[PDB]
Design a protein around this ligand. Structure first.
Ligand SMILES: O=C1CC[C@@H](Nc2ccccc2)C(=O)N1
Ligand SMILES: [Zn+2]
Length: 109
């Protein structure tokens, strides 16, 4: 009844992005803390599915945090905020999204 933690929206503009129902335990945990070559730390949640994003450029395997996957930058399709990455080219599953937990807002359906 009236769940308040069902949908993830973009924290900057409110664009619909994903659902708690779509969280994916990659390697046995939905949460992965990672850093990029510029040393920036991200708390990443894996989702099977997302919407309202704009995937920019072409996939790269360079420095992928997930063995066997190529990544594309995922922007909020509405406001352009960097929300994470789409992962493709791997196995079980072939694709998923890694989204930056603190750039999303959790709320009712
Ligand atoms: O799986 C990933 C996706 C984002 C990526 N960041 C990156 C930044 C500048 C150059 C190359 C990669 C990273 O390190 N790992
Ligand atoms: Zn946005």
């Amino acid at each position: 009844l009236a769940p308040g933690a069902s949908i993830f929206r973009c924290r900057q503009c409110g664009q619909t992005i994903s659902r708690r129902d779509w969280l994916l335990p990659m390697g046995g945990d939905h949460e992965h803390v990672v850093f990029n070559p510029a040393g920036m730390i991200f708390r990443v949640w894996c989702f099977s599915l997302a919407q309202g994003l704009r995937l920019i450029g072409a996939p790269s395997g360079e420095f992928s945090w997930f063995k066997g996957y190529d990544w594309t930058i995922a922007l909020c399709g509405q406001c352009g905020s960097h929300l994470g990455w789409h992962y493709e080219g791997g196995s079980q599953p072939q694709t998923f999204f890694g989204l930056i937990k603190d750039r999303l807002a959790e709320g009712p359906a």
